Amino acid sequence: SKIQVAHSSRLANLIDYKLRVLTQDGRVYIGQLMAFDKHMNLVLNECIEERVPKTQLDKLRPLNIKVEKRVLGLTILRGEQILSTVVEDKPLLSKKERLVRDKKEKKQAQKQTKLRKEKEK
Amino acid sequence: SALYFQNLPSRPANKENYTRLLLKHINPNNKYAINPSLPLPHNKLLLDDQMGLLEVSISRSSKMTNQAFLTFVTQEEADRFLEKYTTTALKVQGRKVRMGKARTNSLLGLSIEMQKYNLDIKKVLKARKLKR
RNA sequence: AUACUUACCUUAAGAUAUCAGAGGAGAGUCCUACUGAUCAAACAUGCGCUUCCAAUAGUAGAAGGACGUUAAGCAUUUAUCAUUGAACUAUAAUUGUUCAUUGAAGUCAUUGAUGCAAACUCCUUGGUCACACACACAUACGGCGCGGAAGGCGUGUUUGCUGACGUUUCCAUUCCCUUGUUUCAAUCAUUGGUUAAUCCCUUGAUUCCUUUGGGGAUUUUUGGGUUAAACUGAUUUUUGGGGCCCUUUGUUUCUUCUGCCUGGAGAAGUUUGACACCAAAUUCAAAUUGGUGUUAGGGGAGCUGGGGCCUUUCAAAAGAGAGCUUUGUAGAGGCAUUCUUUUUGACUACUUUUCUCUAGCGUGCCAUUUUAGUUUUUGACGGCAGAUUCGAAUGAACUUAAGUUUAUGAUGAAGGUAUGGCUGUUGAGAUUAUUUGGUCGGGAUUGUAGUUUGAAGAUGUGCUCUUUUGAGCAGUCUCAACUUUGCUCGUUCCCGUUAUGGGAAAAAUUUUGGAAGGUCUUGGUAGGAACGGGUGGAUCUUAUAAUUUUUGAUUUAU
RNA sequence: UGGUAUGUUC
Numbered sequence: 001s002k003i004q005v006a007h008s009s010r011l012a013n014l015i016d017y018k019l020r021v022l023t024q025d026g027r028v029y030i031g032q033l034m035a036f037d038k039h040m041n042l043v044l045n046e047c048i049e050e051r052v053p054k055t056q057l058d059k060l061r062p063l064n065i066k067v068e069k070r071v072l073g074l075t076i077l078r079g080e081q082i083l084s085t086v087v088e089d090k091p092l093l094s095k096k097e098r099l100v101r102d103k104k105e106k107k108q109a110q111k112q113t114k115l116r117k118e119k120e121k
Numbered sequence: 122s123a124l125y126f127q128n129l130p131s132r133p134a135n136k137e138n139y140t141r142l143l144l145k146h147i148n149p150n151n152k153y154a155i156n157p158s159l160p161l162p163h164n165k166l167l168l169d170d171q172m173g174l175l176e177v178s179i180s181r182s183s184k185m186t187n188q189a190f191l192t193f194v195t196q197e198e199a200d201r202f203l204e205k206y207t208t209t210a211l212k213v214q215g216r217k218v219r220m221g222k223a224r225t226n227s228l229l230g231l232s233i234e235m236q237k238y239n240l241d242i243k244k245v246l247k248a249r250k251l252k253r
Numbered sequence: 254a255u256a257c258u259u260a261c262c263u264u265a266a267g268a269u270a271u272c273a274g275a276g277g278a279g280a281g282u283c284c285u286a287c288u289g290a291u292c293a294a295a296c297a298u299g300c301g302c303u304u305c306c307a308a309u310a311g312u313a314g315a316a317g318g319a320c321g322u323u324a325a326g327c328a329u330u331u332a333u334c335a336u337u338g339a340a341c342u343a344u345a346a347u348u349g350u351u352c353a354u355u356g357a358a359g360u361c362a363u364u365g366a367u368g369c370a371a372a373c374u375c376c377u378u379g380g381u382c383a384c385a386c387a388c389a390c391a392u393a394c395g396g397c398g399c400g401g402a403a404g405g406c407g408u409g410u411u412u413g414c415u416g417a418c419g420u421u422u423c424c425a426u427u428c429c430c431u432u433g434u435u436u437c438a439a440u441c442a443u444u445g446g447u448u449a450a451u452c453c454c455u456u457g458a459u460u461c462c463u464u465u466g467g468g469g470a471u472u473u474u475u476g477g478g479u480u481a482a483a484c485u486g487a488u489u490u491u492u493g494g495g496g497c498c499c500u501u502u503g504u505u506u507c508u509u510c511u512g513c514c515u516g517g518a519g520a521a522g523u524u525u526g527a528c529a530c531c532a533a534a535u536u537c538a539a540a541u542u543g544g545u546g547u548u549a550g551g552g553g554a555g556c557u558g559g560g561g562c563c564u565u566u567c568a569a570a571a572g573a574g575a576g577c578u579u580u581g582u583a584g585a586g587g588c589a590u591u592c593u594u595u596u597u598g599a600c601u602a603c604u605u606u607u608c609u610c611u612a613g614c615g616u617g618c619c620a621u622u623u624u625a626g627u628u629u630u631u632g633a634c635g636g637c638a639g640a641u642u643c644g645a646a647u648g649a650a651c652u653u654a655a656g657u658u659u660a661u662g663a664u665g666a667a668g669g670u671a672u673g674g675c676u677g678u679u680g681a682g683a684u685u686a687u688u689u690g691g692u693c694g695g696g697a698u699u700g701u702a703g704u705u706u707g708a709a710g711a712u713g714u715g716c717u718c719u720u721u722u723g724a725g726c727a728g729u730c731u732c733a734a735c736u737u738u739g740c741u742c743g744u745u746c747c748c749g750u751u752a753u754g755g756g757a758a759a760a761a762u763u764u765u766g767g768a769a770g771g772u773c774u775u776g777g778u779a780g781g782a783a784c785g786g787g788u789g790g791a792u793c794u795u796a797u798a799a800u801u802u803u804u805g806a807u808u809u810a811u
Numbered sequence: 812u813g814g815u816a817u818g819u820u821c
Binding site: 239 | 303304305306307308309310311313314315381384385386387388389390391393394395396397398631667668670671672
């Protein structure tokens, strides 16, 4: 889908990407990751869960496929019953804009620590 | 048998993607337009599309970034093209195109007509005179 | 907010990339602002790299959807079991048919569910960008504009996970304009250049005076100095016109106040601060406490990091001088000699037979000389025909004029000019004769003669080993380094001399690394370096291969 | 050698 996912990136670098994560059933969840852990428990913002019916599976066996989509919103999915994750869609704001946003967050956090040091005195 | 197409979209950075786009916008539900990741056949001096549309030709030169050319099987397919549309703006990505008969036909047109190679040698000599 | 009581708890460890070598500490372990290599992270930086970035010369369209409509669209499929009564098909827990009493749960949904298919409408995204509405291409497309988004590859610097607190008897320490943009015209001021007047220093030239030399004036010739009458590039104050935008929806969104569509503004402040808002008990308002979010964008001077080009200087490598005849030294390597006998293996010559280009001269084959022929060249040159043209300079004709044709047509340029050809000249490629030359026997079989090795004798100078024809060293041969003598070729310069030698640079020039300057482009501009942690977050190992993910009961098969 | 939460008085 001409996204060109990064060639040397991991889960700390794939954050806030619109993932298309596959499970053991095939119940594909599409949404933005915002956190993970050692067991790969993924929170998913604006997530949608898509499946294929049993009648559509005969047409899928060797065209249009009518998938069943349900809307989950902000969910938190476990890492046991998942199989694979890919990157489907890029986020809204770019890498330089995320860098400027992270510098603003660091400056705001340093200002908050200076405010806590001023309130402690 | 070359046709000059003018007021075409400017910048798709790949040439074969613009070829797929143009063969999609000439006729819907084409064999090569509905299926991506298909190797485009090259025709040297094979029918590629229906209604006689043989191939296209674009370039990245700064003087004619928008407009391009197309070539067919023969003059009868071009006459059928201009008799099927008959002064009607065919739709592409956002704009209305305009077609015409070019003052100089394609080199593939010379390959079709002469085989029913000196002009390539003349063009090489003209390029040698221009690059000097 | 202080003071006190009560309820719960008081901590799994070890470490921060890997390999090789050297040194230190009393086989094993630790350290090195120790050295080389790999890898990781950060910041810059470049690869004619890879993909994408939506009409406005219109009322569209690309990607993703509608958890939107037509749509109760069209075609199909299901909507509980058991006992008994009046008939009953009947292997069942009377299954099947019509009616009912009773018994346990009892998805809603049948406008339901699945499949199929078209049209309409609406949402989120973009460079809705700078020039032009243009004749390119077999080496398939001049990817040689300003950027942005995603990614690959390559180079340089720093560090070996990163961030807060404290200390340093550590370094640090800038500003200016702007809060719709752009263009054109008018006016003031400033800077840089050109022309002349009051002019001035030097000089090519003109004129006059005077003592070889100099002085007066002009050309302000050449360069510079004073002043600013005229012209040109740039900045700035004000006014006016034209184009676009105002969704900036709280009318610029950095904040506050005033204020706005006959306009787009004015004033103040900016990171130990300020502004706006939410929540509350104190019984209006007001005040107090806990949090949230903002403090922006563009341009310019200075400093600094990095990328590319050019110039100056130093160090290193080739060029530099090389090739050869002679001497001495000594390095490496190889073997020392000769005859006879035997004929162990090889080679040559001759005999017999067989086969082969023809068994032999010639013929034929091989080299190639362009001497000649034939043939070929996106070969080259010149010219002819489509008009050979163009520097449309000039003359003439057709013609208002333009345009066309033709000449002055080699004075200069375009291979010819063709999108059909052709002429003549020249070289090169192939063949044959020839300037000429070489070649005409080879393979298989049989025996002999000659040379050398396997072996025996005599030998050849001496040392080590040894049964010995024996192997190593002095011996001898060949080659490389120093060294000298003359010849030849030769980079540059000089000299004997332009034959050729002598001397010097042992050079001019190419590359790499380092030092400096100029120009093009980009980023940053207020925090940074060291140490300390009963510091916080990340990464690895073991608990942890056993019910909680991660060391398996999800390919539905007996 | 401590932390979290809660209730009274100033």
